[PDB]
Amino acid sequence: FPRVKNWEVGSITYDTLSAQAQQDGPCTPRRCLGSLVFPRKLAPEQLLSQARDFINQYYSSIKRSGSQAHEQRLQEVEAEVAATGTYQLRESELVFGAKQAWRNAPRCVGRIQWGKLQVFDARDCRSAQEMFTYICNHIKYATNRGNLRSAITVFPQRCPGRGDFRIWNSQLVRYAGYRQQDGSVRGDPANVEITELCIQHGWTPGNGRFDVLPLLLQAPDEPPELFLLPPELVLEVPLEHPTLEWFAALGLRWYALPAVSNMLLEIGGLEFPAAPFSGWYMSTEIGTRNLCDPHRYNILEDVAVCMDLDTRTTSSLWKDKAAVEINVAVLHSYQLAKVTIVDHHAATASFMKHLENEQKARGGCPADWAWIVPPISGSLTPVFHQEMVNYFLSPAFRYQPDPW
Amino acid sequence: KFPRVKNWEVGSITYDTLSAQAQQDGPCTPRRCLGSLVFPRAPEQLLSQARDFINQYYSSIKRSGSQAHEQRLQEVEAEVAATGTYQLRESELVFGAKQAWRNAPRCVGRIQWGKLQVFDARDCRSAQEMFTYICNHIKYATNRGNLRSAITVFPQRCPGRGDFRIWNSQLVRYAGYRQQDGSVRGDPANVEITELCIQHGWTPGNGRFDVLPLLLQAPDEPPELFLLPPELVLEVPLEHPTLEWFAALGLRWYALPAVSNMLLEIGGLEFPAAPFSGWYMSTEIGTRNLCDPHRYNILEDVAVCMDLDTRTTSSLWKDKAAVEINVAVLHSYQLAKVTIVDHHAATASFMKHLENEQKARGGCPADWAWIVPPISGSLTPVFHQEMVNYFLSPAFRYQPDPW
Ligand code: HEM
Ligand code: HEM
Ligand SMILES: Cc1cc(N)nc2cc(-c3ccc(OCc4ccc(C#N)cc4)c(CN)c3)ccc12
Ligand SMILES: Cc1cc(N)nc2cc(-c3ccc(OCc4ccc(C#N)cc4)c(CN)c3)ccc12
Ligand SMILES: C[C@H](O)[C@H](O)[C@H]1CNc2nc(N)[nH]c(=O)c2N1
Ligand SMILES: C[C@H](O)[C@H](O)[C@H]1CNc2nc(N)[nH]c(=O)c2N1
Ligand SMILES: [Cl-]
Ligand SMILES: [Cl-]
Ligand SMILES: [Gd]
Ligand SMILES: [Zn+2]
């Protein structure tokens, strides 16, 4: 049982939940790969073991473990698989499993909210046009005029024989990235490839650096078809600064809803390769990663020029001063627009309280330090001084190969 | 089957073949990663470490498999058979000290690993001689502000005799005093060593920046108290180039970071006293030592004087105050003409170290959580570099406090 110290308070806890982590991570006694973004690489007898496990923790979570319908639900799963090789989740098990998958996500700093999750059951979806209607409903419900609400939409599970539902976009809302003669990119350089695909599947490209991409939605077996997001459904935020009057003239903007649409959801042995989920943004994701990463919009030095900062020498800390003002502008602009957002100080403090809840409720909490600590002001937040244990619990969100 | 490592800023991939030679076992398993923990933790096993280190030394002098190489191997095992231990040649010790620095996964300063002055104090005889050696190390390394990396190696661990130990965790530290209020005056990290110095006869001060005396332990001896001559301890008073009230806080720091409580392991031999020093990266002082809530904890004070709105976290008052403290540190050390490197220049030089080491050895052990600076992490290039953490020998290791 790992001993875990918080160096700011001196307090000690033991992570007993880690002894139950099954699916094995990438580290060995000889070498730690904790910093790798993608670890390593990406007979129904095994299905029964994972299903009986998940049914057991479902009935634990509602007290009713021991006698009664709990004893009953285990047999239906056995009879279901013994008759079909797979099985079906009850609506309530689906809801419980999606909340656990979020609760178990070691890289997510927002898990204090894990019990408030809207789950749309789309397991009877059978069309790409139908997928588009589900996604538009999700977007409308989650955005909610700027008062964002967490939500996931669960499309039908993978089945032996005949293909998967899949969203080819990495998020429901993304900006296009266009190459040109110098190979440099206008727009978002993270999205050049999916942009290239959208064009080669019919899309007419656009103007500049904040064009919302179309959706590439794949029904089983039939190839992907393009869908155009209606502009009144995609809420965006123009970026301005509360005292730097010229900042607005930079023409920056970001979108309201972060909706990851390329991860696979696994529950009780079943795998849902299309299950897009959404919450709301932490400001450093936009202001520090999306706008300031050198391989993203890379705007830092443009802002420093406008601030008249001494870009001639690293030790003026011009990078650091410009980054702070970009995050100030993000927080200001999202508040003015009355769109939900959370700063990295508020977010990390809630994660600490979540660690305390989880210690009492489960005896630990899988956490990935490198992703929990924010990309600016790391040691100014309380999670920097908290040791953390990283491991894999199921239900889970897992990465998966792209559909190409 | 060597780990594949990606840089996300540039898109480049490498393989760390060196990790396959990892000579000890860290704390992670395939069940759970413990990479974020601060402390992760005879004759025949002495001989395998010894042979391995001799092989490394003869490789570096491009003389592997020669008869001098085999002669040294044979002499070592003969000497272990006769005495239970063996003695390093002076050139082996210089090589091994440098390799220990080169192998330190948490050091971002390793581009400099070949420029290390090695002082051989293995003849040291008492605490009084140990003090003289330490004083000359401080004088040499400080060099009136133009700092030079150095290490002083005191006698090895030996069956029959106790260890030489420096009880202080650094050669220069500020006292921490418990108070009436249960608070600490000075540096709260140094409360324990401060209490030990007093109870060994030190008359304390009562300031926030009182330099501590040294407690030096000779084999089988209680530790003995030694005062550093003040003209040896170079300090930098802190000011800010455009916040004139910052000088009135009366903040100071010392020029020389000289870590003194780690064990140096070379070829199975252990040196429990081997203090080493380089020069500061400005965030160690400005963000960790001054702003950590369990250290001097000045961040709120400074933000209030800066007239920031500290009522809400969304004003980012902590990030703004922290940036200006780090500016004060850089400006103050540069004004005093004391060597200092900022976290952007340091992380850029480390990326060049990784490239050099990929060519020389096929990899580089690195602890991402310690290499990435404590502010402005993703503004530096190391943030976007995947890294592989593992233990090579020669090495610097943590060791239990001698009390
Ligand atoms: C409600 C507010 C939320 C906040 C503030 C939040 C915050 C974050 C942040 C900052 C990250 C890492 C940033 C990055 O990957 O670049 C992250 C990752 C993640 N989030 Fe959350 N999140 C929220 C809601 C949710 C919801 C509703 C779900 C799922 C139902 C979720 C599941 C995940 C997962 C699985 C990851 C890791 C994803 C991966 O490894 O690719 N989060 N979150
Ligand atoms: C020359 C300039 C140097 C710089 C800028 C530098 C920088 C750093 C930094 C920023 C750290 C992490 C600090 C922390 O623990 O908070 C570190 C750790 C370390 N450095 Fe270096 N260093 C330098 C020289 C040296 C030398 C000369 C040695 C040994 C010969 C050395 C060995 C180590 C070791 C062993 C650690 C890890 C300490 C630990 O794990 O607790 N460094 N260094
Ligand atoms: C619900 C929710 C809210 C929110 N607010 N955020 C989220 C972020 C993720 C998430 C995971 C991995 C990512 O990315 C992988 C990656 C790793 C390294 C680089 C680099 N260099 C680039 C991308 C990115 C992109 N933020 C997001 C998932 C859900 C989120
Ligand atoms: C040669 C050299 C140059 C330089 N420029 N710097 C160095 C810094 C260290 C070093 C190691 C551990 C530390 O601390 C370990 C620790 C972990 C967690 C907490 C907490 N909370 C506190 C301390 C701290 C503190 N700087 C420094 C060692 C050598 C250095
Ligand atoms: C190389 C490194 O693993 C990579 O930059 C990681 C580090 N930490 C991160 N942390 C968050 N929140 N998001 C990220 O994409 C990353 N990327
Ligand atoms: C809890 C956490 O492991 C601890 O605070 C670490 C994180 N990274 C660090 N990185 C450096 N350079 N120095 C440190 O002391 C620490 N402390
Ligand atoms: Cl994003
Ligand atoms: Cl220090
Ligand atoms: Gd001024
Ligand atoms: Zn690990």
UniProtKB/Swiss-Prot annotation, chain A:
Changing R398C: Found in a colorectal cancer sample; somatic mutation. It is found in: Cell membrane; Membrane, Caveola; Cytoplasm, Cytoskeleton; Golgi apparatus. (6R)-L-erythro-5,6,7,8-tetrahydrobiopterin binds at S35, R289, A370, W371, F384. Heme b binds at C108, Y399. Residues 31-404 are annotated as: Interaction with NOSIP. Platelets, placenta, liver and kidney. Zn(2+) binds at C27, C32. Belongs to the NOS family. Homodimer. Interacts with NOSIP and NOSTRIN. Interacts with HSP90AB1. Forms a complex with ASL, ASS1 and SLC7A1; the complex regulates cell-autonomous L-arginine synthesis and citrulline recycling while channeling extracellular L-arginine to nitric oxide synthesis pathway. This is Nitric oxide synthase 3. It comes from Homo sapiens (Human). The chain holds residues 68 to 480 of 1203 of the full protein.
